[PDB]
Enzyme design. Structure first.
Site, PDB file in Angstrom:
ATOM      1  CB  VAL A   1       0.913   5.690   4.804  1.00 51.00           C
ATOM      2  CG1 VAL A   1       1.554   6.257   6.086  1.00 51.00           C
ATOM      3  CG2 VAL A   1      -0.289   6.839   4.488  1.00 51.00           C
ATOM      4  CB  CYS A   2       2.348   0.464   4.326  1.00 57.71           C
ATOM      5  SG  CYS A   2       0.136   0.457   5.121  1.00 57.71           S
ATOM      6  N   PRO A   3       4.864   1.446   3.112  1.00 58.27           N
ATOM      7  CG  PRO A   3       4.990   2.055   0.972  1.00 58.27           C
ATOM      8  CD  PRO A   3       3.933   1.662   1.965  1.00 58.27           C
TER       9      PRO A   3
ATOM     10  CB  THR B   1      -1.090   0.035   1.092  1.00 57.11           C
ATOM     11  OG1 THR B   1      -0.691   0.068   2.558  1.00 57.11           O
ATOM     12  CG2 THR B   1      -2.195  -1.007   0.759  1.00 57.11           C
TER      13      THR B   1
END
Lengths: 197, 197, 197, 197, 197, 197, 197, 197, 197, 197
Positions: free
Chosen positions: A49-51, A47
């Site tokens: 914001v995740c990384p 996804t």
């Protein structure tokens, strides 16, 4: 207090398969006895914001390790999905090689125990937890999905909790290394109050 | 997930007597419909970390108001204790005049609803909550007693939540006003990943 | 019977942090075995009737101690608020130096045990309890908030319960040391009735 | 709070046959709307402290009635027993002619509702209750059996509650008619504190 | 079958304070083992049918005592009221000196156990119980309040139960000492039946 | 207080097949509205005390009818057994012809409702109930098995209840038609007490 | 299966007073160990189908006893009613001298345990039960009230059960002593089937 | 006494697929309104007593039909198994052509409703039920598994119930068509008793 | 997912009477420890798809036995019906001689334990279960009634479970003996993936 | 019988985000009304048997579509992981381009509704469900993890259910298009059986 997680009490115990240096390994909370732990949950692999949060924590992992603090990320995705994502180049939205373990919470037990599961989607909210060397929960930080956390703030909190543990003084708002601290008793605290006002 | 407080759901309602501009007045969550609210609980008046957080938020209160965000502090102490503390000089450990409301949670209902009561002492932990203009809870931050929070990080988070509200883009880890954001879809997010890695 | 406090049964025990001679000390009811105790609850520090009751009991504290009776005051306020109140001169609405322990009931368990918590405000009613040297509750006095109690009447009742404990006689209405008493059996009671009628 | 009797709430309703001016009549709490009521329970007719309290309240009944306050005595004995006791001379331990009603609580409903029934003996403790003209309970006074209450203190309390009802000021410890009172707000009470200390 | 009282089963045990020979004394069912007991409950001291029954049983107490039967009277009134009533002349509605114990049932335990409480008034109905020397209940007689019992019938019943106990013959309707009885078996009962028809 | 039978409340209603003038007929309590009823239960047909009670009440049925009082006898035996016993001469231990209804309680419902069943044998104890013309129970008389009741006492009690209903005076112990009664109020009762003492 | 009576299970134990050769004797199921029992309930003594069944069974009782089977009749009537009926000539609708015990089920325990009470009337239905020598119920026969059973069929069934117990062959429809039986296994049964068809 | 089946209550309603004249058809109890029904349960197709009962009933089906009585057999076996058995010659243990419906109770609902399931084997006991034309159960016959029923006795019972329905007279033990009956009342039954004794 | 039957857990234990080589024998799951078991349920004997499935498994029984796997068929029909069906030629819809046990589930306990009962009919759906040598359930196959299962697919599944039990390999879609398999770990799986695509 | 999944009942409804032709789309069961559906759950993306089943169904998807049957795969993985796996070449363990929808079940609702969750791992077992055009469940196939299913068998079953739906005949064991079927009634099934034996 989040799920079974309560400030001032033993953090909820956990054990999970994780991706560590491109391989699978069991990781459990009792392995970190004597060390601080920053445990951060995130909703989903592959996804947006995740990384950026995983990569930020990976980049600063050495800064936490110099404080005897281990950083662990966790989502409901499997370790096979995590490994696929680590094997995807960062330029393509992947994680590339990482310096921190990425734990799988496929039964959702970790998310439920830490009280961060967004039940209508089955994914964890951005919940971050700081656990001391005695295994006690000292801080809870949870963000709704659209906004990333701050690695600098996590670092500041770890530094502050270690400072208070080791010196028996408390840290004022915004404390950073070098900042004054207060002796927490009526008479000795006047040294801080008279100097800062 | 803090007591009745849940990210993504209406923040638990609250109504309390507060000290505002040196006088007593009732304050309630519905008074802030249309504005962001930063609600920060703290354990005890006339203590040590406590005044440093209260004064820091009061000193920065107009920085939040320029964004349409109101800051409210609360403890289990009564409004008469709060006023006495406000009338105690800062160099003696007092608060001095303040630019934010200081709510009295004498029944402990606000602390219980927000899940921050430290049960064996009857005082609230350092729980800070960010509520949007629709009254929905977006962020939870709770620190154990010896370590103060960060007003800079509360301000960063209010800014980020407002930014995502108005733009439909998400904020990466560490985002500050001016930083790049991501468009949250597989195709459009490629612009951020190729640029930042 | 007030809460768990029942006349003729051991008074609910407790322990609290108190302000004693300007410093913090742990006070436990079970510590006064062998002496009478006048335990008086009051609603809130820095208010109006309240200082007058605390000062009147403090001023008369040695009259009670000469009878082997200790006076204890308690409110839900913290020991830091009590100390600040004691540090405020009487001329400004403060307590000034105090001659009796002032207990903190921050968890409200003492107020709940004695059945005096005004639930909708989280504060104690003006409940005063006379406990003998066996730890047994002998008298219950509770006033609504606008009216102070009488230290003279508390002293009269302690003297009366001590007198009846010590002699085989009972104390008529309004008894004070030196007044006639009654021997509680049909034939010996005529001595009293013959002289008052 | 005693039985169903709670300060600040409507006193428990009651109805009972009473001896009034040597004849039997039903007395109900609603008969006294608009008047203060001093309701005092006592354990047993033909006993020892008992007649001294009943006679003291009968002798001073007009001092209460001048204030719009009615005094009512009650025990578990029947109206036939009360009447035989009224027909017994005071010199013989009787009550003689009486100027206050004596209510019979033969079902024990009044004692149970006011929480003064001494369960192991089936008799009421010395519980006295001050009820205002709106039927609200304002004061509880309960003595263990060997010590009589004070008619002077009951009269002081009635006067004080009436004074605060009428003027909206509060009565310091030991207040008596003529004594100074305090205006219960942080601004107007300062003059009281300064001029008295 | 009345409360715990059941014909043919052990009478409900009792213990009470009583007025015996002008003084207070404990009376308990186990005192009467080997003796018949006529236990008669009555509603209230200082009333109308009540003294007539107490006096009638007192006047004939030795007639029962010659049969090895003890008569006990009991009401809910206290022992102090009973003694006042014994100390009141019969001409004025008193009992005068008594030849039977008068038991106090102030807790209402005995009345509840024998099932004779008129709960809407808190007083016992006119219940008379005949208990044999084995401690077993043999007869129940309960009158509504306006009608007195018969001492002559109580005596006939005690005689009849003792006769059937000693001889093992049964007593026909209306039996009195001297009257024909029946041998309770088909063949032997013809003696009676042929003679009487 | 017998089963569902309680003095002062409507007697438990009943419907039963009875033998009336040698034939079978339905009898219900409600049929006797406006008249007194003497309802007498007995254990077993073809036994010993039993026919003597049934015959004694039948022989004197007109004594009760002249008073507006009906007499009903009842046992758990069927109407066929009752009829066989009516068809057995009295000299043989039979009932011969009867002037009162003899009810069958084969379901044991009446015996259960009146609380007279001897449960281990399934038969009724010798319970007699006096019910007035308004259907209200006024008197309970229950004998153990070996001793018969008294028709004279049942008649005395019916006469007494009727007199007290009519004159509003109460009957002293042992009252019989022609005896003095007492007016049940303190002042008017003095006429009886001064006359009889 | 009837009440607690289940085919193939231990028959419900019973114990009752019975009339046996004109006298009263206790009869219990354990007295018949090792013998077959035909237990037949009937509704009421002194009725119509009833005498014909009791007489039919008594007349053939020795036919059953020659086989080691005892016949017992039972109704809810008492032993006195049973003896009265035995003492009534058969020509007048009585039982006359009897050759089978008649049990009295006055508590209704037997009829309830066997599930045969017509609950609206309190009498047993015409239920007949065949219990083998090991105490196991083997057969249930219940008729509504207007139709009597068949002694010949009861005898046939006892003989058939005894035959199958001894030989381990089964009895065809309508079997009578001397009739062919079937070895209950697929191969051996063919001898019966080929020869009967 | 059987599951939901009780004498004198409507027989449990039922519906089932049946084999009728070698074909499948629905049969339900409402079809037989106005007719008697003999419903016989049996344990298993292809067994030993079983075919002998089914064949006996089939062979006599017209004797019952002439009385307006239908005979129905039922087991838990399916209709396919019933038909296979019907299609098996009587010489090989089959049923051969059948003149009565054979109902399939595959869900065991009929057997549970009629209380005849042998629960540890899941098969019905040999329960036969006689239901009148109003749908009321009049007779219950249940055998253990090793012993077959009697078609002659089933026919005698149907004849007897029908006779009693039509004439309002009752059938003595062993009644068969042509036998005397009794008019069930005390006076009209005497002729029967005098004639038969 | 079926009744008590869960993949990965011990298969529900069972015990049943079955037809084995034309005779009756008890069969239980514990007899097969150390061997695979194919347990197949079918709805009704003497029906249509059913014999074709039973015959197919019977004809292929030795293909399973050579793998150490036993095949067991089961329906709710009895062993008497099973045997009659085995004794009916295949040409007429029969099963003829069988080489696999046919279990009878007359109590429906196996069908309920395996969750295959079609409750409105009382018959089992076409449920087939594969149980390994440890007694663990590995495979569930359930068809609606109109469609037969596949013996070849049951054999392929048995082969594949045995293959994966004995080797460190898993079986791809469509695997048969001789086919390629995959080593279940990231690196080693590449041999298969690069070889097949 | 699997969760809420029951053969012969409506398949448990479902709605999910899926990957369809390389994009995200909402898929719900009601979209397939009038069409057969093969729903197949699988445990985890980026694993081993998993890709072989998804690829096999994808390769044969038109074979299903030509019968008016739609094939849908589902796992607890997110649609972002599914897309990533589709975007991974088959030679490296990926799915490559797909011709069937791949559904995400991140809340585990579909897996729980179909009773296929392996609770200790939080992943679905290999559950395949065949739903007809009416939305009714017709077939359930569930394999433990190490063994893949068979697309050939799945196709045989869809073909068999469609044929039985259309002709009202039944399909024998091992049926494939062209094979003989059965008319499901006793007489017409005979042609099938006589031909094969």
């Amino acid at each position: 207090a989040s799920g079974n997680a309560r400030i001032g009490k033993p953090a909820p115990d956990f054990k999970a398969t994780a991706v560590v240096d491109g391989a699978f390994k069991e990781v459990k909370l009792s392995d970190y006895k004597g060390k601080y732990v920053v445990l951060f949950f995130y909703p989903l692999d592959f996804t947006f914001v995740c990384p950026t949060e995983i990569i930020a924590f990976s980049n600063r992992a050495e800064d936490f390790r110099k404080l005897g603090c281990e950083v662990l990320g966790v989502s409901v995705d499997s370790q096979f999905t995590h490994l696929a994502w680590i094997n995807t180049p960062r330029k393509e939205g992947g994680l590339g090689p990482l310096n921190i373990p990425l734990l799988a919470d496929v039964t959702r037990r970790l998310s439920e125990d830490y009280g961060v599961l967004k039940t209508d989607e089955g994914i964890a909210y951005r919940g971050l937890f700081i656990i001391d060397g005695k295994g006690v929960l000292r801080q809870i930080t949870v963000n709704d999905l659209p906004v990333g956390r701050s690695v600098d703030e996590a670092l500041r909190l770890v530094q502050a909790f270690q400072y208070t543990d080791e010196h028996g003084e408390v840290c004022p708002a915004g404390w950073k290394p070098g900042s004054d601290t207060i002796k927490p008793n009526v008479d000795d605290s006047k040294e801080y109050f008279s100097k800062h006002n």
